[PDB]
Amino acid sequence: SGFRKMAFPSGKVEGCMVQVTCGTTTLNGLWLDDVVYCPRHVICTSEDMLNPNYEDLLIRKSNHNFLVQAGNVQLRVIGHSMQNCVLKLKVDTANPKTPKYKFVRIQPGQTFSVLACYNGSPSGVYQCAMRPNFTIKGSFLNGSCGSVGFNIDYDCVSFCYMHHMELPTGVHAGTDLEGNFYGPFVDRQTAQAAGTDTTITVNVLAWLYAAVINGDRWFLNRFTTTLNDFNLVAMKYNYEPLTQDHVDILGPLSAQTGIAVLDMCASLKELLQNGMNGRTILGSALLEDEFTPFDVVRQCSGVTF
Amino acid sequence: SGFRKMAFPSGKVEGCMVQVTCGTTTLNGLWLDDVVYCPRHVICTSEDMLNPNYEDLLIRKSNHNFLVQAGNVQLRVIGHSMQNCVLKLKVDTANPKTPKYKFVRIQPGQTFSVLACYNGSPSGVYQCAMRPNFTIKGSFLNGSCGSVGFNIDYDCVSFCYMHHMELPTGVHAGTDLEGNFYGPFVDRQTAQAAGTDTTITVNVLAWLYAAVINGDRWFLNRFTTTLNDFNLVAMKYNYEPLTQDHVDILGPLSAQTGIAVLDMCASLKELLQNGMNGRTILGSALLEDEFTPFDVVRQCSGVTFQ
Ligand SMILES: O=C(Nc1cncc2ccccc12)[C@@H]1COc2ccc(Cl)cc21
Ligand SMILES: O=C(Nc1cncc2ccccc12)[C@@H]1COc2ccc(Cl)cc21
Numbered sequence: 001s002g003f004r005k006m007a008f009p010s011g012k013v014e015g016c017m018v019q020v021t022c023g024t025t026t027l028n029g030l031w032l033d034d035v036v037y038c039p040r041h042v043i044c045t046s047e048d049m050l051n052p053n054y055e056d057l058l059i060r061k062s063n064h065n066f067l068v069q070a071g072n073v074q075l076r077v078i079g080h081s082m083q084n085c086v087l088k089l090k091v092d093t094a095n096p097k098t099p100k101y102k103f104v105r106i107q108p109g110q111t112f113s114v115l116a117c118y119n120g121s122p123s124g125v126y127q128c129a130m131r132p133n134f135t136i137k138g139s140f141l142n143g144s145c146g147s148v149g150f151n152i153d154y155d156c157v158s159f160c161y162m163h164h165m166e167l168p169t170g171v172h173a174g175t176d177l178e179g180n181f182y183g184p185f186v187d188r189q190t191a192q193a194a195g196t197d198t199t200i201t202v203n204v205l206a207w208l209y210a211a212v213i214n215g216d217r218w219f220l221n222r223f224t225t226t227l228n229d230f231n232l233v234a235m236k237y238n239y240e241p242l243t244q245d246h247v248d249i250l251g252p253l254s255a256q257t258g259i260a261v262l263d264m265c266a267s268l269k270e271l272l273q274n275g276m277n278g279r280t281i282l283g284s285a286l287l288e289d290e291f292t293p294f295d296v297v298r299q300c301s302g303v304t305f
Numbered sequence: 306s307g308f309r310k311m312a313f314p315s316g317k318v319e320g321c322m323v324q325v326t327c328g329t330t331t332l333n334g335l336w337l338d339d340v341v342y343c344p345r346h347v348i349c350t351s352e353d354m355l356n357p358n359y360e361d362l363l364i365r366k367s368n369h370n371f372l373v374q375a376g377n378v379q380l381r382v383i384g385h386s387m388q389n390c391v392l393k394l395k396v397d398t399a400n401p402k403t404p405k406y407k408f409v410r411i412q413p414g415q416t417f418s419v420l421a422c423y424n425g426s427p428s429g430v431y432q433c434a435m436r437p438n439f440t441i442k443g444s445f446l447n448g449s450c451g452s453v454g455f456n457i458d459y460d461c462v463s464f465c466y467m468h469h470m471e472l473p474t475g476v477h478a479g480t481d482l483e484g485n486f487y488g489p490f491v492d493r494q495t496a497q498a499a500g501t502d503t504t505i506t507v508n509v510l511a512w513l514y515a516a517v518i519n520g521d522r523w524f525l526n527r528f529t530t531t532l533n534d535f536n537l538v539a540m541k542y543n544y545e546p547l548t549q550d551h552v553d554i555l556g557p558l559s560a561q562t563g564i565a566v567l568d569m570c571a572s573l574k575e576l577l578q579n580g581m582n583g584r585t586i587l588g589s590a591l592l593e594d595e596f597t598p599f600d601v602v603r604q605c606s607g608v609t610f611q
């Protein structure tokens with residue numbers, strides 16, 4: 001019993017974190033095989049950040065300008081290149097702790113674990129979701145750039161996020177490991193803002209199924225709804241539309257609890273129109289949207305890595 | 306910016322998790338140097354659990370009755386002893402991945418990270434707190450016994466909890482790494498129940514200081530209170546009494562934000578009376594009590610967002 005916001009065990013990623021220094025700037029790097037990946041803004045001064053020409057700033061650097069530290073050992077940079085918004089530093093030593101891995105681009109609504117780092121040292125691990133507006137609600141201070149987000153599939157680590165910046169509302173923006181930003185953001189000190197966010201409907205439904213599995217049933221009702229009527233309600237409350245794909249994905253949870261997806265949608269509709277009336281669900285007075293259907297099945301079944 | 310429930314990186318603990326088997330029972334063990342620590346109830350059958358006599362059950366076992374598996378390698382047990390509710394199995398190989406460590410007994414209100422394991426394999430990591438009734442609100446299924454709780458302040462792992470059982474309300478009970486239970490619980494299947502739980506007041510205050518550091522002041526008021534008047538009101542909402550020790554511990558957060566502890570206590574009294582009125586604090590519609598004063602200082606910026 002119990003339901004917690006749970007992250008993947010971080011050990012396989014901790015053995016890949018290194019410190020990257022270029023001039024006065026220090027940030028984190030990810031060391032896989034003989035390459036260190038880090039945000040390309042490591043080569044910038046604060047004035048360069050106003051309007052940077054990264055190819056131009058980079059041509060002025062040599063291999064020895066990049067200091068890479070792995071624990072207490074200094075790594076030797078033997079090459080450097082840029083791919084989108086990521087800098088790739090070729091080093092002479094392959095990481096003996098390199099896990100089995102993949103680089104994956106995730107979609108909004110998908111969750112991942114973040115290993116927050118400072119000076120190449122891991123400080124904490126937390127779970128979060130790619131919001132529909134492509135930002136993440138992380139917890140990051142100055143020095144956290146280069147911290148990574150990941151999932152573990154079987155024994156393979158899938159790297160999906162690298163941290164680059166904080167927006168004025170305190171939310172965060174970054175790239176996949178191929179350097180492509182999530183969202184309409186750019187790595188430049190210029191006016192940028194997070195767009196209006198929405199709630200991840202399929203994830204709220206998954207969390208309601210987790211509450212039922214844990215013995216919380218006060219919100220259940222005898223009613224059902226159509227997908228079209230539910231989507232008209234969900235639009236009124238700034239909830240993402242629910243598709244037939246989402247309904248199919250919730251199938252196993254629907255069969256386990258005996259509550260059809262559109263039956264749970266009728267509970268969600270009543271919660272949106274009336275509130276919780278002083279009650280809580282899994283210790284929360286708000287509807288939680290940062291657990292996917294897969295996260296719910298994984299936690300309620302004890303899958304190991 | 307941001308404020309998240311954050312766990313310590315689990316790598317140092319993952320390299321210690323092993324699987325322990327005795328007959329038909331399988332659970333998790335913690336391998337440090339040449340000793341594997343696990344709950345003593347691994348020697349019990351389900352029928353033994355009502356009134357087990359662990360000394361009588363253990364004297365009947367030999368070293369080769371305990372199967373210890375570390376990854377794909379079978380470890381050899383060369384000795385066994387019991388200390389309180391923990392079984393200690395001496396093995397013929399020291400763990401090469403043993404971190405710098407300590408065994409610490411924590412007090413109610415303290416937080417720690419839990420590495421949930423099944424069959425000696427880690428499945429997830431989450432942040433927990435020792436409730437005032439000595440239970441923990443964990444997420445554990447059958448086979449999770451032996452999973453551990455820890456903190457890693459600086460480079461040393463301080464092990465503080467080993468999981469033993471689930472109570473009828475779905476909450477969890479366990480021991481320190483010396484085998485002493487937290488609370489009036491026993492490793493017996495006799496009728497046992499968690500006492501009435503209360504809210505950890507010093508932790509709610511710490512979390513309100515985190516909200517001020519991150520820029521939110523909507524809940525502050527022009528009032529102050531005495532410590533005694535605050536406690537009379539707090540106990541009516543099932544909040545733990547706030548002691549002078551708690552007031553002293555909140556000193557650094559008070560000095561950083563410029564809000565006196567008894568001034569923050571007056572805001573808490575008003576929140577308990579009025580509720581949030583459709584507002585949230587750090588993304589929550591409830592008052593959070595699983596962040597200590599130390600957790601807030603570790604996670605937050607040293608400069609308040611004025
Ligand atoms: O956002 C940035 N760093 C930070 C990241 N995460 C958290 C922070 C918290 C506080 C202060 C800085 C934080 C830098 C500063 O301004 C820019 C502009 C563009 C880029 Cl790509 C990167 C940065
Ligand atoms: O509680 C126990 N195991 C579990 C632990 N955590 C979570 C669970 C979830 C589901 C089912 C069992 C879970 C066992 C079964 O009954 C007893 C009685 C006493 C002791 Cl010391 C240990 C146990």
Ligand SMILES: [Cl-]
Nearest residue numbers: 271275276287
């Ligand atoms: Cl609501």
Ligand SMILES: [Cl-]
Nearest residue numbers: 410411412415
């Ligand atoms: Cl303590």
